[PDB]
Amino acid sequence: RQYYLSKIEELQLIVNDKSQNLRRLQAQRNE
Amino acid sequence: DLYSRYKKLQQELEFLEVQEEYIKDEQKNLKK
Amino acid sequence: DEFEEFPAEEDAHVWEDNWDDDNVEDDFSNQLRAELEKHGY
Amino acid sequence: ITSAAGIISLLDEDEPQLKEFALHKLNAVVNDFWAEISESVDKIEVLYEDEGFRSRQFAALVASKVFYHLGAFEESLNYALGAGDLFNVNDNSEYVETIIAKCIDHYTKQCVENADLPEGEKKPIDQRLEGIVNKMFQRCLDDHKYKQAIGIALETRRLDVFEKTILESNDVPGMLAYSLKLCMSLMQNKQFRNKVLRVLVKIYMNLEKPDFINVCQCLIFLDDPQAVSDILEKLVKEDNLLMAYQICFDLYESASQQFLSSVIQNLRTDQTLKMIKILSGEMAIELHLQFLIRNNNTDLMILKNTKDAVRNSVCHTATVIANSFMHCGTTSDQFLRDNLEWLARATNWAKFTATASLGVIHKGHEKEALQLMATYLPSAYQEGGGLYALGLIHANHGGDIIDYLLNQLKNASNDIVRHGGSLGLGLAAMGTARQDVYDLLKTNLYQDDAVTGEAAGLALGLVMLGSKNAQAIEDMVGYAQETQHEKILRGLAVGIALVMYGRMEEADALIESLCRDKDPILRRSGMYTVAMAYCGSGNNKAIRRLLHVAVSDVNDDVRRAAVESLGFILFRTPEQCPSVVSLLSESYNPHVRYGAAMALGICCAGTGNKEAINLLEPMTNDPVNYVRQGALIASALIMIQQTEITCPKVNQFRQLYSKVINDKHDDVMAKFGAILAQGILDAGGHNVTISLQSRTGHTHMPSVVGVLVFTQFWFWFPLSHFLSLAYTPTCVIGLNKDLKMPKVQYKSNCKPSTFAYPAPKVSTAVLSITAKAKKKEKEKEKKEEKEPEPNFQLLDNPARVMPAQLKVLTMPETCRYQPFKPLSIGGIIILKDTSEDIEELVEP
Amino acid sequence: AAAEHSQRELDTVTLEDIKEHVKQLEKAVSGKEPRFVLRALRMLPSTSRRLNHYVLYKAVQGFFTSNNATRDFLLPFLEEPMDTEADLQFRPRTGKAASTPLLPEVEAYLQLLVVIFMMNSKRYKEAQKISDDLMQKISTQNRRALDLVAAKCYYYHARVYEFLDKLDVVRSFLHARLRTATLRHDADGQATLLNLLLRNYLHYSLYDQAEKLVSKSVFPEQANNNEWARYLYYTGRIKAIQLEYSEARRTMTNALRKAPQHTAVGFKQTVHKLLIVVELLLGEIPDRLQFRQPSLKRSLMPYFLLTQAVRTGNLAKFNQVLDQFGEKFQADGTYTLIIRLRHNVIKTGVRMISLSYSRISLADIAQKLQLDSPEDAEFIVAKAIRDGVIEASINHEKGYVQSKEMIDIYSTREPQLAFHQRISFCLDIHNMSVKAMRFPPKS
């Protein structure tokens, strides 16, 4: 069960930075 | 829940990519 | 964040000092006195 | 100490025995000195490359470990795979964990490719690689909870292990429900979806008492009409009956008319006559009609303050369309009967909406309707309206009405009556794909009468709904870039949109061919075709195709149909959508802003998300008039059947709708949203809700079509009534026998209170002596001196429960009669009748 | 005593700091940003001190206290305070929070503080048992944030072993533990582990073993300044020994530039020690402003007499210094490098002659460098020319070492290339600044 959970725990880091990124791009836009 | 978390996360990543692509376009088009 | 890993292991002269100053050589007047005397004779 | 790496000198030697002690030793010390052995590589590699070494299978392990330490995973599995037994089987160490992770990570990539090209061209899969994964598959099976390996099972195809996992000990068949839900929701390949479904059905059949409810629901997506027909017959021959009824009653509430028409046909080849009677939809409308008529309660006071607040503008059509919602499927036309002179204050086209409004009010009336329509409205517009009105009553279920409609459409003034006629016939035989109807609809379209086209186009699309008819799509478009009369295109734009409903990959050419055509109307039809062809499955490819046009394209109309079209494809997951458009909805051209509201509305069918709402909150103040108009409609669309307790803005907007309508200096367009919004909030007397998603997770073809053509009200007011299709009575019928309607008393779980049915100068100071008199006057004054609440609502079989409360419903365990189909999902359910002395028959 | 009363006030403030750390630690876990922890970990060295036995006990009696075996592990390993009058129950976890197992971040952080206290209390074994268990705890723990808190503990754990003075028992452990990070794309943990590992390698002089590890391994570019400074020194030490001098100066000077302005009096002391010796072997007289600085004044004074020797070229003076100050060099780990110089003093004077003279006749070079014969200089003159310490051509037809005719660089392509490396970094800085910009998810 370990690999199936480590894999989700690295894709979680990538989506996390994407979400912080999408917020910024929304900010650069609305201005 | 090992599988369940997996598909929601990967779906989120795939969908957040679309938001990036659209926002990247709209920033460009707005600049026009 | 002191690097305690690397142990942190009179001449209170203010002026910044250049390498050439340390050079040990006889005073200038003695050089010229010799140089002038040598070519003088 | 082990502070050196000269062993690689041993592997430099030639004695085969001496290599083995070196190779063994490195694998005993590779975990630390991965550096030097990295430069060796070839030395260790050649040992395995050489087929004569005595312990080659040990060479790869050490070499593989060196590469795993170095980090070239692309080569680590290669050597790991080459070895065996000791290679990775140990399944104990971290290096094993990292190699296995990739190996099962590598496996899926090949298998996904393989399932793409299975016609012999499929690339080979190494047995050791399959060996390790299946060994893992055999590992994941026998280790611990199988609800995990199943996910990895379907992660890398491998249907055999999928069947093995669920069919194995599996604790209980509950994990079958878990797998089924995952197959429907988080599966993005239809071809796999079919293959997963076949496994889910096959497991269903072999069960001792197969779950008929799920199996028929499973089959519907699998598109197996004949298979369900044989299931129905055996259930009848086995004397099951009681379970057979729900399978039919659940079937009609999800499937398509073509599916039913085929499934009914198989049966024809006593009780079966009952089965046919209930699959065709006779019963559902009648019970759904009996519900709404028996449980109707529409606050006519709300309309009155809107009728008297109308400034005689074009908002007379709004009130005529507003009430249609407030009485959709209720037959309570008291308002139109009551206020009669005012009804006649609208003439020309609005007369066509009013005549149509009568049809929606008698929604689901059936046999009485044919005379019913002729009685009230027996005028080119009015007659055209009645014929269109007749279709609404028999919407999706014409049956016999189609033949009369076909005959009546042919004999017409070749004017408005033809316009209403085609729309009525198209609506009546919606999805029938009937050739006879289609040929006549074409002739009217080829008539090229402008107003005729706008209805023939939609009628052409609806009749061919989801048919992919190559002739229809080629023919429909061929008219588009060959006709003037923009109006005819407006119908054709949606008309060819619905022809591709739900294929979801099947054409994908009209989506690309149309999006490139210069004619902006066709482009919109291309964008809509993305909505109707990708409804539900939020394909990230399409959503990127569609947001693009809404940001770059120039013709603003296509831009709107771009942003708005998102909702149809994201409606299965209302969570993502309130975020995607949250920034679209402030775009510099107000058209794109409009698409945001309608996108938010269609997106969130009936949920009081309060996240979509808050986005529409600032919009409702938008300077543009049409951006405001859509905002209220989008808000009203999502806020249907929700009390202030359910969503804390519902009561806030209601007075905003009242304020906008009762205002005098707002543009009529904002009001049209206001009037329409009023009808949406109380549609069906607070007894219907709009939800494109079916009860069992399906895409509701009647409901989704309803909204799409409704959104095309900007181009035609009389299309407005098409939202009547999106009203699904939020009801649970306690049908026990075929016709018995017992007065079942069942209870809900309204926790802290009840909800649902909502609603029915200055004193001047004069400080000189004011206080002295008042302080002396007071002195003169002194001288003068739910726990048992509803949620146990004793409601007849027609009990209105909104979608959020279908779960908090408490089983009628107290009542002598309890339901045999699980009574937690609204709709029509079979009451499991207890011991004899059956009574409490209801049939008003 | 009021000193301890301020101490417990320091404890509570450290507890509040810890509670700030734990609340931020618990913040990052649910805050979806590992960045938060870095602030708590930077206060770690600051809060690392200022703690006695009462601190952890109340912290561990304030934190944890879930009745978990955790209390049973570190409470015995630290002296417990008496029934103190100011029993401020500092429990950021109340009931359910106590019932909920401590997140792997805070537990290690608290355990590290015990570990730090263990170091602060010289209890490297109780910390050893604490720490390896910490690792034995965090070895299984696979979160994304714990990698940071794990990284700090690692060096302390390497540091607890560092005071344990074995460094081979952790040679393997830190060697494998590193590989756990790299298979995780983790940023900080890989950085911290490598530096501690390398320190292990140089400490026993396995430069060959070390030179490999840097060869295959890649140091995360987006690494902590503190770490980036460290790795550059160790690589500089390795490169200098490997006879790649010119690169040794570039990294060491760059390593020095990254020193934490004024916190690490030591690191700047040692690097300058190698830089001065490294520079001498390459033929460059080091900067004088070094030897006068306050912190490095007496520390580098031993090297001072050397650099004066090389410029003077008085070999007798050079040997005299090694005889006296030489022994001290060994402890600094530089004696060997100085030994290289003793038979390399001729190079600089060959550079001094090539920097000023432009056509010096060989016989003259012999006179001004003390070379025994005009023939001997030729090999040395060419060799310095051969080794790229000069830019001259020896025309043996008439025995004159011509220097290269320098050109107008601004008309050649050198300035453009120097501007490119500059502009690429300047543009990259803009992207890195803009790329993060950390617009908080609009609240």
Side-chain angles (χ1 to χ4, degrees), chain A, chain B, chain C, chain D residues 2 4-844, chain E:
Chain A
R1 87 91 178 255
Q2 246 308 335
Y3 136 92
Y4 331 93
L5 198 153
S6 86
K7 175 152 284 182
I8 83 182
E9 214 165 344
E10 54 82 11
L11 154 55
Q12 177 67 342
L13 193 153
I14 202 179
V15 304
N16 187 310
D17 73 27
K18 225 86 298 183
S19 172
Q20 305 247 347
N21 152 282
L22 194 70
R23 299 162 192 172
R24 172 188 60 106
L25 286 189
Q26 301 258 314
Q28 211 135 35
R29 206 208 81 196
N30 297 3
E31 154 68 358
Chain B
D1 276 0
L2 170 40
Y3 185 66
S4 77
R5 196 139 64 265
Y6 186 38
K7 202 46 48 182
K8 312 315 179 314
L9 283 194
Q10 152 187 117
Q11 295 289 60
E12 149 185 7
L13 155 56
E14 190 38 47
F15 173 77
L16 251 49
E17 262 320 338
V18 179
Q19 313 214 230
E20 248 177 337
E21 197 64 11
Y22 139 73
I23 177 86
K24 285 182 131 43
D25 261 8
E26 222 203 348
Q27 196 156 207
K28 212 170 80 196
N29 203 42
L30 266 62
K31 187 73 61 53
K32 202 168 316 270
Chain C
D1 316 330
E2 58 290 7
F3 296 159
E4 222 60 48
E5 316 77 11
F6 296 140
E9 197 135 332
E10 184 178 6
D11 286 295
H13 72 325
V14 187
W15 40 98
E16 161 42 59
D17 36 351
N18 158 278
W19 281 123
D20 293 33
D21 198 313
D22 295 309
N23 200 0
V24 51
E25 60 248 36
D26 39 13
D27 266 12
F28 179 41
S29 74
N30 269 8
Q31 301 190 43
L32 256 183
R33 185 180 309 165
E35 205 27 71
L36 278 173
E37 169 268 344
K38 302 188 280 107
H39 100 81
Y41 84 84
Chain D
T2 62
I7 297 140
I8 87 177
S9 287
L10 305 170
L11 307 94
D12 194 15
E13 314 297 352
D14 39 357
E15 304 85 345
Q17 184 264 332
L18 162 81
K19 310 176 161 268
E20 307 244 339
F21 172 47
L23 259 178
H24 264 225
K25 211 70 195 83
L26 276 206
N27 183 14
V29 85
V30 158
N31 65 316
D32 231 326
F33 304 148
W34 50 283
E36 313 84 337
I37 323 161
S38 57
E39 282 89 320
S40 71
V41 278
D42 293 33
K43 301 218 293 307
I44 319 315
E45 259 60 359
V46 86
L47 261 69
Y48 179 40
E49 300 333 290
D50 159 46
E51 297 175 351
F53 193 67
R54 159 188 143 163
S55 209
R56 314 151 71 249
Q57 313 317 132
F58 205 108
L61 178 39
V62 200
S64 318
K65 297 178 85 293
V66 177
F67 280 68
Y68 140 76
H69 272 54
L70 195 163
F73 305 119
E74 82 295 333
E75 290 196 17
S76 187
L77 309 169
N78 282 16
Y79 282 60
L81 189 67
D85 312 329
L86 60 150
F87 86 107
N88 275 124
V89 163
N90 74 97
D91 74 283
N92 193 359
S93 147
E94 198 287 344
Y95 144 70
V96 200
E97 192 295 349
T98 164
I99 299 311
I100 77 143
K102 284 285 154 305
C103 266
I104 57 175
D105 162 27
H106 194 347
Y107 187 38
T108 165
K109 156 59 49 176
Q110 267 182 343
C111 217
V112 179
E113 307 337 323
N114 294 125
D116 302 349
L117 297 312
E119 62 275 34
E121 150 159 10
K122 193 204 307 302
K123 335 296 147 284
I125 301 164
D126 157 88
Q127 313 327 320
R128 312 160 310 216
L129 196 37
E130 182 293 337
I132 171 65
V133 171
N134 83 271
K135 136 79 156 152
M136 215 36 42
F137 267 131
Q138 188 48 93
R139 280 205 60 263
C140 49
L141 280 157
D142 75 321
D143 206 311
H144 211 333
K145 301 277 131 296
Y146 331 91
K147 77 196 331 303
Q148 153 184 329
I150 162 60
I152 308 314
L154 46 80
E155 186 195 2
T156 167
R157 334 320 290 191
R158 267 292 286 290
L159 330 170
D160 41 42
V161 50
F162 180 9
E163 217 198 43
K164 273 182 51 33
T165 49
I166 300 332
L167 278 70
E168 267 184 357
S169 40
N170 80 84
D171 321 300
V172 284
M175 89 185 333
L176 163 153
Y178 145 89
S179 147
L180 192 154
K181 191 282 195 192
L182 270 295
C183 158
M184 221 175 302
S185 100
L186 311 193
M187 214 43 29
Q188 228 75 19
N189 297 346
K190 298 298 281 164
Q191 69 286 33
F192 199 177
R193 155 78 46 60
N194 289 345
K195 223 166 299 312
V196 190
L197 256 300
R198 314 300 307 288
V199 165
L200 288 204
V201 47
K202 184 201 189 275
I203 179 191
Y204 279 139
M205 262 311 88
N206 48 71
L207 279 207
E208 69 276 10
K209 27 190 84 64
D211 203 35
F212 323 97
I213 329 170
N214 278 32
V215 63
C216 65
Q217 296 165 348
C218 259
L219 259 74
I220 278 278
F221 321 141
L222 242 194
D223 301 1
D224 219 325
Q226 163 44 250
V228 73
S229 51
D230 58 61
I231 297 316
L232 261 207
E233 205 85 58
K234 51 180 61 66
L235 219 77
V236 166
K237 280 201 58 36
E238 175 258 339
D239 194 17
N240 169 246
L241 248 172
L242 196 161
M243 251 299 134
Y245 270 49
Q246 264 319 133
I247 293 307
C248 162
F249 254 44
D250 317 309
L251 200 82
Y252 163 89
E253 102 200 288
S254 265
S256 81
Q257 161 254 298
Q258 302 136 20
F259 197 77
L260 304 135
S261 85
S262 33
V263 171
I264 325 161
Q265 269 290 351
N266 299 190
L267 300 183
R268 194 192 310 298
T269 319
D270 192 6
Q271 193 44 250
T272 175
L273 269 302
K274 199 76 196 43
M275 271 275 168
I276 316 174
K277 289 298 307 321
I278 42 178
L279 271 175
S280 274
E282 292 332 301
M283 203 83 46
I285 297 329
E286 295 319 321
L287 281 276
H288 280 312
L289 184 63
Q290 283 290 69
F291 164 26
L292 276 309
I293 313 308
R294 263 64 191 147
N295 202 352
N296 161 22
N297 165 17
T298 81
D299 190 23
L300 326 188
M301 278 299 342
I302 215 83
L303 251 195
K304 161 192 140 191
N305 56 66
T306 283
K307 79 161 91 174
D308 54 42
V310 86
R311 297 274 80 61
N312 205 263
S313 90
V314 88
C315 32
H316 55 72
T317 197
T319 280
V320 172
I321 175 63
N323 94 294
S324 100
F325 297 160
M326 301 205 181
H327 306 123
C328 154
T330 86
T331 72
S332 148
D333 59 27
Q334 287 107 46
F335 168 91
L336 280 195
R337 267 329 188 262
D338 278 56
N339 210 292
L340 208 159
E341 181 46 1
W342 150 95
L343 161 53
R345 268 212 310 251
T347 202
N348 296 7
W349 269 119
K351 154 160 77 155
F352 182 70
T353 307
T355 49
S357 147
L358 181 143
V360 173
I361 278 176
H362 306 284
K363 157 152 199 213
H365 222 100
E366 300 328 280
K367 66 196 61 52
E368 209 167 307
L370 171 43
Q371 274 44 57
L372 164 157
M373 271 315 328
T375 67
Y376 327 115
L377 278 300
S379 191
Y381 286 71
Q382 172 260 134
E383 212 201 337
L387 191 83
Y388 171 37
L390 202 181
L392 273 281
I393 299 165
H394 312 91
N396 205 3
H397 201 295
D400 42 58
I401 283 283
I402 277 305
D403 281 19
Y404 159 78
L405 255 202
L406 224 34
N407 157 30
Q408 184 34 42
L409 181 145
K410 190 160 307 315
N411 331 117
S413 88
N414 256 12
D415 325 289
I416 319 88
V417 183
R418 208 151 178 132
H419 168 102
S422 86
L423 249 171
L425 152 68
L427 202 47
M430 187 221 307
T432 206
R434 274 261 311 281
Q435 193 61 317
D436 320 324
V437 52
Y438 175 79
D439 169 288
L440 160 53
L441 285 208
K442 204 172 271 283
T443 323
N444 294 16
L445 173 47
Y446 281 9
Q447 215 82 20
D448 197 282
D449 255 357
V451 192
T452 286
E454 190 270 5
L458 261 78
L460 205 75
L462 298 193
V463 62
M464 275 317 89
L465 174 37
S467 67
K468 184 70 223 72
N469 218 318
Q471 279 326 302
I473 179 57
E474 148 188 40
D475 246 14
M476 250 180 305
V477 297
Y479 207 117
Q481 63 293 20
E482 146 151 19
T483 180
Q484 318 312 288
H485 312 269
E486 271 222 65
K487 270 218 158 306
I488 206 175
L489 296 153
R490 257 165 257 176
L492 262 289
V494 182
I496 73 195
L498 291 163
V499 62
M500 226 76 68
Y501 161 73
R503 314 311 261 171
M504 172 96 67
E505 309 90 25
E506 274 182 76
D508 176 57
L510 281 298
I511 280 197
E512 170 51 34
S513 178
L514 265 50
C515 206
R516 100 189 147 82
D517 254 13
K518 306 280 172 34
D519 178 85
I521 289 330
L522 263 295
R523 251 201 290 249
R524 233 178 52 223
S525 188
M527 321 276 299
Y528 283 143
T529 278
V530 151
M532 291 335 298
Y534 279 76
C535 198
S537 296
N539 199 304
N540 309 85
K541 180 213 70 52
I543 173 153
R544 197 209 323 298
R545 163 166 270 284
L546 218 176
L547 271 163
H548 171 267
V549 158
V551 169
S552 147
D553 188 301
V554 291
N555 172 295
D556 306 310
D557 264 350
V558 76
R559 274 171 91 130
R560 194 206 78 217
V563 152
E564 160 285 343
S565 192
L566 290 165
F568 292 137
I569 84 191
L570 310 195
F571 91 90
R572 190 72 55 57
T573 178
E575 187 287 321
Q576 317 209 270
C577 154
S579 63
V580 58
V581 173
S582 320
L583 218 77
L584 274 304
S585 79
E586 301 57 48
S587 147
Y588 66 114
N589 54 350
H591 282 79
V592 176
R593 232 172 321 162
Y594 181 110
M598 201 65 28
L600 258 45
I602 303 191
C603 160
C604 298
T607 77
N609 196 7
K610 159 63 188 187
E611 302 329 288
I613 287 190
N614 185 349
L615 255 182
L616 284 189
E617 191 55 348
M619 228 150 274
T620 193
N621 258 318
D622 218 339
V624 197
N625 72 74
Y626 67 96
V627 61
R628 186 188 346 146
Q629 152 183 352
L632 300 177
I633 299 313
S635 146
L637 194 48
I638 57 200
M639 259 176 20
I640 167 155
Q641 283 192 352
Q642 297 178 6
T643 77
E644 187 62 14
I645 202 164
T646 76
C647 43
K649 313 301 321 163
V650 54
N651 187 40
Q652 191 277 293
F653 276 48
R654 270 213 178 122
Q655 320 139 47
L656 173 151
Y657 293 177
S658 303
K659 176 201 67 38
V660 60
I661 180 39
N662 220 319
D663 188 327
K664 264 102 206 159
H665 325 82
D666 247 15
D667 298 37
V668 152
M669 284 310 176
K671 314 272 211 73
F672 191 26
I675 314 300
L676 264 176
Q678 294 295 1
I680 293 302
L681 271 196
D682 317 340
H686 318 83
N687 293 318
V688 278
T689 197
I690 74 94
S691 147
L692 314 86
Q693 140 184 299
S694 87
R695 327 211 53 82
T696 184
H698 208 322
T699 181
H700 200 226
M701 149 288 283
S703 188
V704 160
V705 157
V707 175
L708 164 56
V709 53
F710 157 67
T711 62
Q712 288 321 98
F713 86 109
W714 187 341
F715 303 139
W716 214 225
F717 279 7
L719 298 182
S720 175
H721 313 283
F722 264 118
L723 198 55
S724 69
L725 252 63
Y727 294 143
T728 52
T730 164
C731 90
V732 58
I733 297 69
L735 181 73
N736 57 5
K737 333 278 200 315
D738 38 352
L739 268 309
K740 164 140 174 201
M741 205 47 38
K743 284 174 283 299
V744 184
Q745 311 87 11
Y746 47 66
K747 60 177 48 48
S748 173
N749 221 4
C750 329
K751 309 257 112 170
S753 61
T754 64
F755 51 70
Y757 253 83
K761 323 148 37 194
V762 196
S763 189
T764 40
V766 192
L767 83 175
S768 45
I769 38 185
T770 187
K772 198 296 196 287
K774 286 173 81 71
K775 84 208 214 174
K776 176 74 60 62
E777 188 41 64
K778 303 319 275 217
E779 224 199 314
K780 299 168 241 146
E781 288 313 315
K782 143 178 71 36
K783 315 166 179 102
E784 310 314 310
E785 312 320 295
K786 288 179 179 180
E787 26 201 4
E789 75 183 3
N791 90 326
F792 331 113
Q793 283 103 353
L794 186 154
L795 331 172
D796 225 344
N797 321 97
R800 56 140 312 179
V801 47
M802 328 154 257
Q805 284 64 7
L806 96 172
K807 64 163 199 193
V808 304
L809 192 144
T810 314
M811 207 160 228
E813 65 176 1
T814 180
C815 173
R816 176 186 178 92
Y817 304 160
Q818 29 81 20
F820 183 59
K821 169 186 172 69
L823 179 50
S824 305
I825 47 155
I828 317 199
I829 76 86
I830 48 168
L831 177 81
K832 155 64 63 160
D833 223 15
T834 39
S835 299
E836 211 59 34
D837 194 5
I838 67 105
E839 295 299 323
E840 299 86 42
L841 290 64
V842 194
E843 277 183 350
Chain E
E4 77 131 5
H5 270 41
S6 310
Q7 163 266 352
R8 48 241 307 95
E9 171 179 356
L10 264 298
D11 303 350
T12 184
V13 74
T14 58
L15 275 321
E16 303 142 13
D17 291 332
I18 299 165
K19 139 183 302 293
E20 175 66 354
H21 304 135
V22 201
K23 129 202 175 185
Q24 302 308 76
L25 282 169
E26 296 136 350
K27 158 166 298 175
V29 166
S30 312
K32 301 296 120 296
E33 149 200 325
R35 282 192 179 179
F36 294 123
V37 318
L38 310 152
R39 101 193 54 266
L41 290 172
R42 277 195 174 181
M43 276 81 274
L44 202 48
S46 99
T47 204
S48 79
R49 294 157 289 275
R50 294 190 290 102
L51 43 81
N52 45 58
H53 300 86
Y54 172 87
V55 194
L56 297 191
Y57 181 90
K58 272 259 68 171
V60 314
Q61 295 279 175
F63 304 88
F64 297 90
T65 49
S66 311
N67 292 13
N68 311 156
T70 63
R71 287 194 46 179
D72 312 357
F73 208 98
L74 72 158
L75 273 311
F77 283 159
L78 59 88
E79 300 166 6
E80 324 190 352
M82 55 314 298
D83 189 10
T84 182
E85 316 89 28
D87 273 319
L88 195 280
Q89 295 288 334
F90 197 103
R91 326 166 164 227
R93 327 223 285 166
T94 68
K96 319 170 182 179
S99 78
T100 61
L102 259 194
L103 294 162
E105 223 66 37
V106 301
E107 52 191 28
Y109 182 90
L110 266 291
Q111 212 161 7
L112 183 54
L113 265 50
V114 202
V115 166
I116 308 166
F117 184 67
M118 291 294 100
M119 329 173 111
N120 302 0
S121 307
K122 272 66 56 191
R123 270 109 74 167
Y124 317 123
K125 322 214 64 177
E126 318 183 8
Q128 210 162 341
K129 325 308 168 183
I130 280 178
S131 56
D132 73 335
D133 190 23
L134 172 46
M135 326 282 165
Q136 281 156 347
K137 301 288 180 50
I138 74 94
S139 57
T140 60
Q141 305 279 11
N142 210 336
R143 304 217 33 175
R144 184 39 71 259
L146 154 80
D147 316 346
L148 294 292
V149 168
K152 200 55 182 178
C153 304
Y154 293 151
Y155 143 71
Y156 296 27
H157 181 88
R159 176 93 168 285
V160 311
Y161 278 81
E162 195 104 329
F163 293 117
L164 289 189
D165 321 326
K166 330 251 286 179
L167 201 66
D168 315 51
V169 290
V170 287
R171 186 175 166 189
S172 187
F173 161 40
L174 310 165
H175 215 154
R177 184 51 61 150
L178 189 159
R179 175 50 29 57
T180 313
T182 296
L183 316 187
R184 184 178 292 89
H185 279 238
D186 180 8
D188 211 303
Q190 184 198 334
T192 303
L193 286 168
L194 197 52
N195 285 350
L196 281 293
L197 199 53
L198 256 286
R199 184 191 179 94
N200 191 348
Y201 266 35
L202 263 52
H203 191 316
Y204 293 79
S205 90
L206 301 63
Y207 292 124
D208 178 25
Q209 197 63 18
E211 194 281 340
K212 301 315 194 63
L213 165 56
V214 310
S215 186
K216 325 328 307 175
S217 58
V218 61
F219 196 12
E221 165 58 57
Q222 88 315 326
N224 160 344
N225 268 309
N226 244 336
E227 299 302 1
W228 243 124
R230 246 159 169 263
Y231 158 76
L232 291 176
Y233 163 40
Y234 290 118
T235 168
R237 187 34 179 288
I238 275 302
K239 270 325 207 299
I241 284 307
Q242 304 289 319
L243 201 184
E244 306 198 21
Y245 282 118
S246 167
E247 250 300 354
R249 191 218 323 181
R250 205 279 279 161
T251 307
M252 281 215 68
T253 278
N254 202 69
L256 191 63
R257 194 151 51 51
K258 199 65 51 63
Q261 170 49 227
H262 181 278
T263 326
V265 168
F267 176 22
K268 271 181 283 196
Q269 286 176 350
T270 279
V271 163
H272 276 266
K273 287 189 173 187
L274 195 40
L275 202 47
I276 279 172
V277 182
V278 156
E279 269 196 0
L280 275 160
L281 292 155
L282 204 30
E284 300 185 7
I285 316 295
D287 183 10
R288 155 42 71 70
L289 293 92
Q290 277 172 354
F291 304 64
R292 91 161 311 179
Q293 302 215 340
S295 59
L296 332 175
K297 181 192 174 185
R298 173 185 301 180
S299 66
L300 267 150
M301 167 306 308
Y303 304 70
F304 188 120
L305 321 195
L306 210 48
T307 207
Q308 207 159 7
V310 175
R311 180 174 48 85
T312 57
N314 183 350
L315 50 99
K317 286 183 172 302
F318 185 96
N319 317 346
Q320 147 197 334
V321 179
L322 330 173
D323 310 340
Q324 163 164 340
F325 286 75
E327 163 292 307
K328 150 70 140 51
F329 300 152
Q330 266 166 21
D332 309 41
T334 300
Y335 201 96
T336 86
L337 280 157
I338 308 294
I339 282 297
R340 303 222 201 106
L341 204 87
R342 155 131 184 77
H343 286 240
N344 189 217
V345 178
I346 208 48
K347 177 163 73 281
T348 279
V350 179
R351 203 171 80 52
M352 297 265 154
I353 284 327
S354 95
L355 184 140
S356 63
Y357 296 57
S358 81
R359 186 174 303 180
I360 175 178
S361 170
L362 307 164
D364 276 356
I365 271 180
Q367 196 275 106
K368 259 182 145 253
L369 270 54
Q370 322 222 293
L371 301 192
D372 46 28
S373 83
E375 306 76 7
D376 180 18
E378 267 225 358
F379 300 126
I380 209 52
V381 176
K383 176 64 168 303
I385 271 180
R386 191 194 67 98
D387 303 7
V389 178
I390 296 333
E391 275 331 286
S393 313
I394 279 182
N395 160 6
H396 210 307
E397 311 183 7
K398 73 181 65 61
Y400 86 81
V401 189
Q402 175 75 19
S403 303
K404 182 169 188 58
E405 55 283 356
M406 164 30 47
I407 331 172
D408 179 7
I409 205 50
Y410 199 65
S411 211
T412 310
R413 185 190 191 271
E414 167 170 353
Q416 195 295 336
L417 219 36
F419 288 139
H420 174 23
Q421 333 211 345
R422 214 69 44 73
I423 277 180
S424 211
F425 169 114
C426 293
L427 293 168
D428 171 292
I429 280 304
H430 164 278
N431 292 327
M432 272 179 342
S433 101
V434 161
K435 91 92 177 182
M437 199 45 144
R438 190 38 27 69
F439 253 121
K442 169 48 187 53
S443 63

